[PDB]
Symmetry: C2
Subunit: 146 residues, 2 copies
């Protein structure tokens, strides 16, 4: 479908699906395989890359054969925002009826129109109104890059 294609093109589709399932409690290689309908060799490469990226950590599960489960890391827990963003990105310019994947309010089924930025004072502004800039701790090199 269109959002899978965009997300594959940008290299995040499987990471999004696996991270999502890991954050929902899936742990064992076979859980991932059956639930995501993904071939083993590819599941393995994608798990290892999530691990190398520091988003999941492998932890012993059993002895003979020694098998591992995959549990999210504090970073991976935080990565939820990024995954959600990739979907809002992928759904940009697609009408809601028709969408195969949606960012919604978990309580109702209410779809998310857009991300907003919450400032310290209470106010919410659109992202178009925000910018990436150098921070107080930034080196000379960082300042130049920004």
């Amino acid at each position: 479908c269109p959002i899978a294609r965009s997300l594959e093109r940008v290299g995040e589709w499987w990471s999004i699906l696996i991270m999502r399932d890991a954050l929902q409690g899936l742990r064992r290689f076979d859980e991932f395989s059956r639930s995501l309908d993904i071939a083993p060799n590819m599941l393995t490469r994608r798990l290892n890359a999530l691990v190398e990226a520091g988003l999941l950590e492998r932890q012993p599960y059993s002895q003979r054969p020694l098998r591992y489960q995959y549990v999210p890391t504090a970073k991976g827990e935080d990565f939820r925002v990024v995954l959600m963003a990739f979907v809002a990105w992928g759904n940009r310019h697609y009408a809601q009826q028709g969408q195969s994947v949606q960012l919604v309010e978990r309580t109702s089924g209410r779809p998310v129109r857009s991300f907003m930025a919450a400032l310290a004072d209470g106010r919410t502004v659109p992202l178009e109104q925000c910018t990436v800039q150098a921070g107080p701790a930034a080196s000379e090199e960082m300042r130049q890059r920004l």
Copy 2:
């Protein structure tokens, strides 16, 4: 540097820096090279990957011997992802410890978090949203979700 390192582990640091430059009007190879202080092989790898991902488009600049790279509509939309990666990388850094910051452009005011504006006019924490199957999902897709 801390944030650069986490963002590099996730394969996005140079992408963030290049897209932001492109979104700001940098076009040519040496512009990115000097502004970002990036070596040419790395820059070639990253520019090509951004083109291949459909985020930048490469157009002809000159004969003997150059291209320019302009953001695509998908690339303009990518802002939210770049900003989300920065918020992610700043999660757990108190403000005075940050080298890269997400701020309101008008004032220097730091962005504390993202919220979600909903269809019914409400705005809730992103922490309260979820990715789920949409109305058009195939059978395969509903299983994946």
